[PDB]
Ligand binder design. Structure first.
Ligand SMILES: Cc1ccccc1Oc1cc(-n2c(=O)cc(C(F)(F)F)[nH]c2=O)c2ccccc2c1C#N
Ligand SMILES: Cc1ccccc1Oc1cc(-n2c(=O)cc(C(F)(F)F)[nH]c2=O)c2ccccc2c1C#N
Ligand SMILES: *Cc1c(COP(=O)(O)O)cnc(C)c1O
Ligand SMILES: *Cc1c(COP(=O)(O)O)cnc(C)c1O
Ligand SMILES: [Mg+2]
Lengths: 364, 364
């Protein structure tokens, strides 16, 4: 039916590993002492969850995750506050998105309240892995995979749900904004209408690696995802895309693409539109933006700031775009960046407990 | 570099499993005594291949195949002939397609001649699993996965290449053409231009399970994949699509969609075009076909036969399509099916050694 947090079986590790130095962390390469596992079958339903030492998984080579990408994931953080209390940030929005993605993958449904409480107990046991730095955090990685030992393409009769914990340094080791260059080639598409691009399913990511390898060979750090005959700008790598500018009607506007099927609905993207509506100092539009809209705006000095948004960066400014043989400069870093700074400081003030907020949950 | 077939290390099993009855067999559920494994790293290149007892894989929970679908596969058969010689059918076209898919997924390349000879030693050791029946076969499943223990989205520095063996019955246990109904819903899209739909990469398949669940709920046996504002017919499930008809210009024609990036280039699709070109008895077009093209043709009595093609079926005739709330009948089974029968009998005669061919390899 569903596993229950109150049925948790806890098997502690006998020897603990030494914590790495917080200002030399490489994202997702170091892992904590413990993981969570929960097994499912169609014959016997959900087994009882386990909290046990990190270990390798024992998989049948026939497992449908390794053959037909029957798999999905999530990404959220835990923050050690300035009062030394550990907090989660909008974790219910992550659980909601994981459930929607499971239905679209035909993985078995689960109680969202029971997963989050299991996850809370996993961080509570391993709580010293949450760094003693207000520029560092602990990444939480829920993962859900088909483990059906057969090659037939179908809805799986077996599955594992597991959670990893990995400490991460600041995205900007400098401590202030390093702007990124983008590779813009219309030859590749990330996601299409009628597709799965608005879910965090593994198969959306496997196909982007060739494009990223090409971006790096041409000196860029990320891909700018183009879509359709009018070259709509959609996403920046695995981050949502925002543009602060004077629009076509002469009005100061913050703009992001709409949730029309090809966009991942980011927790950060939701948080930033809510803040922009509350401040009410400028227009806020979920609308379509093209390479023509952007180059026409730069000719008339109308562009202020371009930045990516996600759990990775919070905010990630853009300085240039390579497109049809030329480098196009974006004046983000010559305009402050005023809005990008204000956003970074507000969201970190909420994350690290410098102000009270509906958006945070203290670990009990 | 590459692994080398002459470096093979063989560890035979001490206890062997009992062979299933060939007159049952459910696709991809029974596995042989032995598997092939080859390890790679960026640091030390390709390790030596192994032939050893079937076993579970031991993967780090961080492995890039379980998170970002860094994975691809192939599918080909071995046939026990009427002279009791075991044969492979066009296995060089499977190796060519595996190499192309590896490059597009950023997995390491390998020597195609070395993999095939390792595969031949695998089937030769387990040659009694190749069924004693001219309606049965041994399915061969090469698989290639990223095993990088890290959450970073990038090209893997670690990988496993492995091969599974599974005996399978005839597609239709009766041994005669059961025609299939197709579910045609344009809200699902299999593949887009600028994507990976022309490679056998895992992420292309994970997305299709919900659409197939819906097809079965409405009484159909496969999905008809529609594309674009004009509703182009592309593929039938995981089979290529063929239409035998009088075209617009009054000419007898065999038609199939072009290789413009949203079609998997089937081995059977290759084999069927080569046969049609050789016979020189009617026109052969790789062209676009829409639902309008089809319903205009049916109104004018111009359609003869529609069928799927692949390793699964060889040829799979179509009797109906459900589209915009109506059932549309295709007269495949009232026209013989003459062409579908001629194709099935030629390709099976070559697979089971009832005539000599360029397209087959006797096992050494
Ligand atoms: C949002 C998201 C979606 C899917 C998987 C992981 C995700 O989160 C992260 C992604 C990251 N990443 C990469 O892994 C790789 C590149 C690349 F494009 F440069 F290759 N960019 C990147 O932002 C990170 C890089 C450094 C520190 C943290 C992260 C991070 C977090 N937290
Ligand atoms: C496994 C596979 C993946 C990608 C491409 C081709 C593939 O080959 C096969 C696919 C099969 N299949 C399914 O697994 C599932 C449905 C579904 F649509 F009905 F769900 N149809 C099906 O033909 C088969 C069904 C019965 C006997 C053999 C195969 C088969 C072989 N050989
Ligand atoms: C995860 C992700 C985002 C941002 O989501 P957050 O919830 O803000 O971390 C954006 N685009 C893609 C493609 C993603 O996978
Ligand atoms: C494998 C496959 C086919 C059939 O290819 P064959 O090599 O003839 O078995 C057709 N369409 C898709 C999408 C496939 O994956
Ligand atoms: Mg409940």
């Amino acid at each position: 039916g569903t596993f229950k947090a109150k049925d948790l079986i806890v098997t502690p590790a006998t020897i603990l590993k030494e914590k790495p130095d917080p200002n030399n962390l490489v994202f997702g390469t170091v892992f904590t002492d413990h993981m969570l596992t929960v097994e499912w079958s169609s014959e016997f339903g959900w087994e009882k969850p386990h909290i046990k030492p990190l270990q390798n998984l024992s998989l049948h080579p026939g497992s449908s995750a390794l053959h037909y990408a029957v798999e999905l994931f999530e990404g959220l953080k835990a923050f050690r506050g300035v009062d030394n209390k550990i907090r989660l940030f909008q974790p219910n929005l992550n659980m909601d998105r994981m459930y929607r993605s499971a239905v679209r993958a035909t993985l078995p449904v689960f109680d969202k309240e029971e997963l989050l409480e299991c996850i809370q107990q996993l961080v509570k046991l391993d709580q010293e892995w949450v760094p003693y730095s207000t520029s560092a955090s602990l990444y939480i990685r829920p993962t859900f995979i088909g483990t059906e030992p057969s090659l037939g393409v179908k809805k799986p009769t077996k599955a594992l749900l597991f959670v990893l914990l990995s400490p991460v340094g600041p995205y900007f080791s400098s401590g202030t904004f390093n702007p990124v260059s983008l590779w813009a080639n219309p030859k590749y598409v990330r996601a299409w209408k009628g597709g799965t691009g608005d879910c965090k399913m593994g198969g959306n990511y496997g196909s982007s690696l060739f494009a990223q390898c090409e971006a790096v060979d041409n000196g860029c750090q990320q891909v700018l995802w183009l879509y359709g005959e009018d070259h709509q700008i959609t996403e920046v790598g695995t981050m949502n895309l925002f543009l602060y500018w004077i629009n076509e009607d002469g009005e100061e506007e913050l703009a992001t693409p709409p949730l029309d099927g090809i966009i991942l609905p980011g927790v950060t993207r939701r948080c930033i539109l809510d803040l922009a509506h509350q401040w009410g100092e400028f227009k806020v539009s979920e609308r379509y933006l093209t390479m023509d809209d952007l180059t026409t705006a730069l000719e008339g000095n109308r562009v202020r700031e371009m930045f990516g948004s996600g759990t990775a960066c919070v905010v990630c400014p853009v300085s240039d775009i390579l497109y049809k043989g030329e480098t196009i400069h974006i004046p983000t870093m010559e305009n402050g960046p005023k809005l990008a700074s204000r956003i970074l400081s507000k969201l970190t003030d909420i994350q690290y407990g410098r102000e009270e907020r509906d958006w945070t949950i203290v670990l009990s």
